[PDB]
Design a protein around this ligand. Structure first.
Ligand SMILES: Nc1ncc2ccccc2n1
Length: 172
């Protein structure tokens, strides 16, 4: 099917969550005509809804805070799909407050998953990959579904700039 069968549900879910959270959100959908196998279409909805929720709750800041930080007042959330070879790539991007890598390291140390000495040299991707650890605090459940579809997921984020989650699905 076109992924529009999934993506057409999201503007409703996104305004509803924005109203509940007192966030002003500019939601943009691109690539909705991108076609993929029915099994992916019937399963990819729940993971995507989780990522959109995360963007609106934890990423986009309220307008007053964005103005105070010198950002464009209304936060933007972009959900896109495209073909890459025989794969489909789906991205959820926001221009919100990002993921705080220092907080992740602190939590990791508190949980005994790494010591201070080793935290100093972790890469960005190694740090963000703690988010997929079960119970870390979720992104594990999103990963579980994606992996069940033989997909991969990655996260890029920077503090104050925003977050991009990318899901790559096979042709299957
Ligand atoms: N999009 C987004 N933005 C901030 C987050 C902060 C914590 C965890 C997930 C997040 N995801």
């Amino acid at each position: 099917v076109p992924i529009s069968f999934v993506f057409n549900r999201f503007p409703r879910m996104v305004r509803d969550l924005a109203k509940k959270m007192n966030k002003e959100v500019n939601f943009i959908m691109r690539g909705e005509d991108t076609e993929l196998d029915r099994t992916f279409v019937e399963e990819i909805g729940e993971p995507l809804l989780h990522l959109l929720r995360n963007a609106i709750d934890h990423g986009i800041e309220p307008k007053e805070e964005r103005i105070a930080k010198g950002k464009p007042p209304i936060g933007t959330l972009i959900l896109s799909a495209r073909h890459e070879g025989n794969n489909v790539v789906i991205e959820v991007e926001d221009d919100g407050r990002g993921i705080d890598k220092e907080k992740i390291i602190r939590k990791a140390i508190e949980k005994g998953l790494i010591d201070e000495s080793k935290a100093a040299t972790l890469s960005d991707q190694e740090i963000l990959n703690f988010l997929f650890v079960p119970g870390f605090s979720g992104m594990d459940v999103v990963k579980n579904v994606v992996e069940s579809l033989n997909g991969s997921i990655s996260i890029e984020s920077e503090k104050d700039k925003g977050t991009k989650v990318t899901i790559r699905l096979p042709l299957t």
